[PDB]
C-alpha cells in the first residue's frame, strides 16, 4: 500500500497472537514495542532517542505480522512512548520512501 | 526518488543558505535542527521521543529546500543529536511511505 503522512503512519501488526497498533517509523534503526511478555531470553540494549536513552529487553528471531506481512527478527521491548517499527523490520517488508 | 531502508535515510537540505545533512523521518511529528540561529520571533516548546522531552525553540514560516524541493512550515531548534525532517514538512515534498 502507499501510506501518506498527513497523520501518523500507524497500521495493525499481530504478534503473540495479539493485535495492537504501531508505528512505521523510518528514524528508529530498530524495532520497540511496550511493556509485554515474549518467549526465550533477552539481552540488554540501550537505545538513544531525541531525550536520552532507555534500557530496553532484545529478543531475537520473533514473529511479527506488519499489515498482514510476515516478518521476523530482534525486536526491542521497554518504556516506549508507542509501538515503533523501525528498519531492521521495514526492510523486510520491502518498505521504501518515495517522492 | 526511491529511497530504500538497509541505512538510515540521510539527504541533503538547505537552510538559511547553509546546507545540512538531515533524517527523512516518518516517526516525527515535527522538524527539529541542532541549535543554530534562524530570522523572527520563536516560541519555546517540549518535544518528548525515546528518552523524554527536551525544550526547543519554534520558529514559524521557514524555508527549506529537501533534495531540491522546496518547502515551507515550522522548524523547531534545540538540543537534537542528529536533524530531523518530520512529517510537517515531508507531506509538502509529496513524500510516501511505500510497500
Ligand atoms: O529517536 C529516534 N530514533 C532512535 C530509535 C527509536 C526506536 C528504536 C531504536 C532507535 C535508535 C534511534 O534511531 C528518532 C529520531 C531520530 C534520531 C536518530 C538517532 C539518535 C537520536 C534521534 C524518532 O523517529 C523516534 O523513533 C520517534 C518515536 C515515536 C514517538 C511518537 C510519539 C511520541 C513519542 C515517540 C520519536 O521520538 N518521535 C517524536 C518526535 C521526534 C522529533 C520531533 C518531534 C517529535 C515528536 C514525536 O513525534
Chains 1, 2 share one sequence.
Not at 501510506?3 to 501518523?8: C, D, G, V
Not at 497472537?17 to 511496550?34: I, N, P, S
Not at 520473533?62 to 498482514?68: A, D, P, Y
Request: charged share 20%; hydrophobic share 40%; net charge positive.
Amino acid at each position: 500500500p502507499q501510506i501518506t503522512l498527513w497523520q501518523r503512519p500507524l497500521v495493525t501488526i499481530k504478534i503473540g497472537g495479539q493485535l495492537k497498533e504501531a508505528l512505521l517509523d523510518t528514524g528508529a534503526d530498530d524495532t520497540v514495542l511496550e511493556e509485554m511478555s515474549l518467549p526465550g531470553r533477552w539481552k540488554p540494549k540501550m537505545i538513544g532517542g531525541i531525550g536520552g536513552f532507555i534500557k530496553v529487553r532484545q529478543y531475537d528471531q520473533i514473529l511479527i505480522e506488519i499489515c498482514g506481512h510476515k516478518a521476523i527478527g530482534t525486536v526491542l521491548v521497554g518504556p516506549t512512548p508507542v509501538n515503533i517499527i523501525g528498519r531492521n523490520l521495514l526492510t523486510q517488508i520491502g518498505c521504501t520512501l518515495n517522492f
